[PDB]
């Protein structure tokens, strides 16, 4: 069992053409770029059937044109070793210390030399031999792991755990990097992961009590939002603190919730981590909350939002420092192997892609594993870059405790079944070098045995509670019952005028100063468009000291160059913000804040719910460049905004602006899909809005932040009627003018008792049916505006329809197919909480497949056809 | 305006610790390495401000301890340029000759040895000099590329065409590669783009004639499907042939439609390529059918679709022999910079960890481009690998023809005004060096503008037709009229006895070889579930001689050890396939072929629906473990799946199984989304069923495969129902019974006169209604099963209501929560079909924000409450 290919015979060969000293030197090299293909890194004699195995010729003296004759002749290495000459005997020897034995690394591709050398010097040098007292601390850790896995798999035989047997190294490597992390002077660990060893973590790392996880097996699951539905127990968070064993250091821990999609957790928490940081706010030289985060190999190489997330890495709106990433390669998937799972060598090759750092490291070595999570969260502070860590280990039984692994993979299981532990080894191995004695080694074992019997039995005196139905979650937070949110005649004026108070020599583009002129305008004369409505109650809220973003897809600009809240001087490039300086000249340390994201949806919109849940009191907001491209974020909505509060009771106040309307532009240019929303409804989860007017916007949005009820708002915006004239709004409607309205009656009637047939409408149609009743002098007719879709508010509709006695028809008009838009839920649920209401007539376009027609012509006889019908 | 560092002063050093023919060899090393950081690949002189800017200290003489001093000195240089021996002056010479110009390579980090060598000795050969004819051709092709452009600007001033100014030596680039692929001797190149320059690949590449592309910037749009709503002009797909220009080569060329979604045909157009070359059968020396894939670069890098993609590119089931990228870099988003776009310094550098080369070429040197697009075909052919090339180029208007790009980007739209283009700077360069004479140079002008001058005129004397309303395309394919599905019963025996001819030395798991003994026996005795019959189905169509592929996470055994289709000798690791070998045996050369995917849901399911559809003579199904990871293929249910036919008349019959059914897993593990399909159904677009017994899913499959129908088939399948001994069933009902049965009446009821309650039901949930009947002894209660959901069977609704004449209710039950499941659909659309029918009432569980509990007692309780409402 020795792991190199043996010296081969061969004749002395001439020092002639390429001198030996060349030679020698491009070996150095080789081992340094490559010498981890030949490294003992699995504890396993296993190589897998069907995968391909790369060429490692570089790595033999044959293959450089050297002999078994040269190995006592002496050359110049250039510095390596610290020596200027040695022998090829001494050379070989120390390649294949550093890099051929129980960790293996890749460097080389790094660009930087700086970054090089501080690596390759550290890699050299080896890792220092330890302390009896923190060899005996590692014992302590490895103990507690598998201890815990036995006691459960004895008490409760069938349930399904998901175990880290096979794997226990985990912990000291969590516990090693956390550790340096406090000796640095930092604040916070945040940490995201899946569902192998999460029991495990929780209890080992973090420092939940044993009793809730007993309580939790034995069917009393801990209530976090009354009334809710609740999750498995491998999907829930927590918090705690770690104090430094050998130190006067302590820190934060903190665990965040997940579902069971794979690796949608990873733009949630580096969001928490951005919102964590900011609120310290230590400037460039901060960065002091770490994120660490954990992945299976399967999956880590095959789901794409993987590279996606790591891709925002180094961008100015997304950078946190850098990310400590651990991938438990454990050789399997479920029943799948490597050799159907991906077609990279290893698992963690994104990182080559990136330019950063892998480290692979045998499961079976703790000192070694130990000694690479301390190197990991150094290498972060003083490059703030990402590093991947790969820890080579097996599953010991199936995929969870119910299966059987023999069925699809025998020979590899042939060599698992019957091994030694990593505990049993290690504790075998320090006796051996007389470094524990025998009481302490069994000490160690029964002390902790004793801890986890005592908690049980404590648990199990008290007796079993039966089932009982939940509730629900709809009356838990209240409603903001008599608030006002007018800003005055002395705050709107300030607003308009900070887009007048230019830096001393900048100018705006031609193309963009008439914009910013009737900015300062508007705020006394009237005609105040949709884009400054939304920018107004943004400007006001930061003013009054509070922290805005908002970030999106060419989201500066606007995608219809409509908003324009940085501006560009053409002869020099300077930018301006200029409601960010006018709340950061207020005294109340108020921010305003924008960013253009990268072309994702997913990553995208994860990173915003993420900033949601890490600082409560932020205002946020993430916008699509047409609301089609949102079903790219599904697993987002579905997994998290919809339907987080119900089960795990985290809550957040994001806001979704999504573009809508029906134009002509084509199937994937008109609908954001409001009766997808709508189905996601129920229990008053979450607003869904579609205002028609400016000021309304305005009034929406401040009530939401100002409001005590932490649940999310889904605002359809619009796109055409950005520029109507018929849709601006007078200074009056922002400052006298006190709450918003969720419906809007009509305003030009005459006479109500001559009324016979009221119209339901929302949005931005409106205004067509208005323009063709004044065209046509109808007397008989009044439009009314729905602009609160989600909660429905009923009494207001009821209040509306009693103005018109004589009425005999009730008509709902919509602009999109009939199986889309809002009729479906209206149909279904109005009807109820109106008893004494007409039956509703639809009047809208056919329900089709798709979206929308692809031919203009087309959408314009549909348009005409469908206000034809709606008056007779 | 020279590149280079200038040469610095210094002192000659002397020739002491390592010698100067090792630093010598370093510099060589450096070049092959990292010379592309300062080669001459960008048209503009334009650097971004926000990027970081890599070292490249590797590149002067000064850092490997060299000066001016040692320029025409001689030295050892071990081979490099067909040499022993060398002066600095000359190496210098020629690494900057290979590595600084116009191309720079990236292939250093390639392990395979004789890969590198191949590279190597071609990037220092050098791009060989064209002949007069080539040049003049070369011309012809940019001319055409320009004149095409201008055209449609001078005619159609406002209209949207997403222009290819800027970067037309993209028309040469495609037009050499697949006359390369000709000259190789191949079949077909597949082609996938997005919008940018679109119109000008269809005239220009694959040859879709000129009057079509007038006439739909006119408004006459060409039909797909008869009644169908179509889509923009530059979502289209055509075919044509490719003539090689100094060959007698022949080769067909085709380019398939997609949505505005980007990079959402990758996972399509490689699936089409394996279904085609699967057809032709040629081998592993095959793979004849080339697909080239165009990008863009803000995409590239953001999306995670793209590497999720490349991922599948070695493994089994997915293998097409390499991939030739296009990225066309032409330095800008909408009005976003790569500094907030990527975290890479190249948008190219996801090849890095894929082991694959990389060609950077300069878009102003059409020579260059014309080798680059020659080499990476012929680098395809010999190793089987993806290939990428960035062409370097610019935009010269706007993002669409009504922005204005100076508002965000000033300073670099002060570089791209008023440049002169590559078609006029190419002319200049030959005429220069005597290659072409000016009546040459004049003529290929004036033919091409005249050409395009005819067409124009001849479409313009047809007079414009005016708009008319869409029908829709429900009755545009034929239903299967008097179709009978049943098989023999000597053709049953013999499926059945495929499970007993084993191998000559093969023994089955102990676990698994009692499934395969009642396999044997249940063919003659009865009890026959779920997975059988599922195999039965697709085995008798794989005798008749059909291609059946199956292809999911772990479906070769079964996520839930149900389908044991390939099994394994636990000795010996030999594989054995029953079905695909009884079908091989029969003459008529069927296949039946299982494949294990990697942990993807949108590039699993696009792959499959992409083989359907290159293929229309298969049976092609997809399974996902559990029907909630559905929703992260969001995207191509909603743009090919659904909506295809109607958008561009692509048919399709891809079968979707999705597990669905509540028993107490928790929220991520119960629900497969049917309100969500069912929204998406109208004009018949798909067929979505939940059959309750074996025999009938099998008659479902066998009426889909056999008619002419060609629409997809969404199935709901069961989890604890597999092994349910009251759901099998027996030979007769595969033999006797002729046809799918939609509507499934009691099959208990004594007396149909003395009924007055009907219950409606879908799925599991019947056996527990049944079961309670039963026990109870209610004779007047009638459970009537729903298999088919859409179309709605309202016939036979109505016919089974009919033969129970004192019914005085009726209730509509299901397992789901009341906004979700099949009841928003029914109780919307059954009533208007059914007139005569009586109220409906729903008994179900109540509306939630979640799918299910995560809590199992309270799953429990809710099951009683809802069975004990039903019954009174
Ligand atoms: C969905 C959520 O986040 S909370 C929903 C919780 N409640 C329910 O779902 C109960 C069922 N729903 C209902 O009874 C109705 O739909 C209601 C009460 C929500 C609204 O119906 P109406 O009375 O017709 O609407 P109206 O606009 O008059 O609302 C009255 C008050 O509710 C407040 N309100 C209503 N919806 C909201 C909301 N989403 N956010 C904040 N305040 C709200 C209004 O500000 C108003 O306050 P006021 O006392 O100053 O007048
Ligand atoms: C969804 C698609 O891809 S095709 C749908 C096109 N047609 C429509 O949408 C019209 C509106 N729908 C309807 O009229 C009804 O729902 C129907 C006719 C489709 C079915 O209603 P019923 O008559 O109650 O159902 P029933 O099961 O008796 O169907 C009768 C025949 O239709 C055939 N059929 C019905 N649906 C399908 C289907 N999805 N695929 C193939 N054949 C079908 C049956 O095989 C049967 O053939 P038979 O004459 O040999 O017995
Ligand atoms: C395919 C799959 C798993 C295999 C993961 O393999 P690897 O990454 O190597 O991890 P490890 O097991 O080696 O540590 S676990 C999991 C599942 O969902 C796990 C349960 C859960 O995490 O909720 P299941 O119950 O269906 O098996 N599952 C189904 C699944 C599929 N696709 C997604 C996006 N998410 C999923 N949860
Ligand atoms: C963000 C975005 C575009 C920029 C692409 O930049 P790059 O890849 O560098 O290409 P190029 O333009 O430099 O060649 S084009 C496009 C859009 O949808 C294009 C239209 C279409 O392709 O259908 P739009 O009309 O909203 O701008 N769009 C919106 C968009 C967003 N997200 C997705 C998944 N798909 C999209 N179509
Ligand atoms: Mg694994
Ligand atoms: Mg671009």
Redesign the pocket.
Known sequence: NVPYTPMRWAQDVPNTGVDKNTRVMQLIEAYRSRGHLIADTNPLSWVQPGMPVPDHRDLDIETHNLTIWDLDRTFNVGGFGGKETMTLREVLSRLRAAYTLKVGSEYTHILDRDERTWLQDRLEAGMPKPTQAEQKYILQKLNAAEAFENFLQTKYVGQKRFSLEGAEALIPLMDSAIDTAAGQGLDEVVIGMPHRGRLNVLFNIVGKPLASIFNEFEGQMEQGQIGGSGDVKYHLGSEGQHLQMFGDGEIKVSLTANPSHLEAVNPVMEGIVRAKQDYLDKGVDGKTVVPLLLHGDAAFAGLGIVPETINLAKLRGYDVGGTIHIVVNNQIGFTTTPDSSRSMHYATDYAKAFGCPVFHVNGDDPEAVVWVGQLATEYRRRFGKDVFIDLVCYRLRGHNEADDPSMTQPKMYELITGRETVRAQYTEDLLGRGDLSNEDAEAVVRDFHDQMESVFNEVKEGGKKQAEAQTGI??S?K?????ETNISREELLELGQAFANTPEGFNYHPRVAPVAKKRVSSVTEGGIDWAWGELLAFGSLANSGRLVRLAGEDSRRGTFTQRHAVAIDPATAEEFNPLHELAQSKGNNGKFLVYNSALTEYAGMGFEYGYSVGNEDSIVAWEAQFGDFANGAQTIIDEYVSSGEAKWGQTSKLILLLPHGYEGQGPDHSSARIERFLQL?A?????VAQPSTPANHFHLLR??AL?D?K?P?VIFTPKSMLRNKAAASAPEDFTEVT?????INDPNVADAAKVKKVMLVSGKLYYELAKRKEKDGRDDIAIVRIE?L??????????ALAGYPNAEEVLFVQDEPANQGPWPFYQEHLPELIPNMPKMRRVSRRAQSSTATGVAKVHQLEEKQLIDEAFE
């Open positions: 709809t009356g937070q409603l903001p019952h008599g608030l409804c229990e008053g989860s979450m607003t009530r939401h409001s009820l649940r708002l709450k918003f309205q969720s419906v609160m989600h909660p429905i508010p009923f009494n207001r509709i009821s209040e």
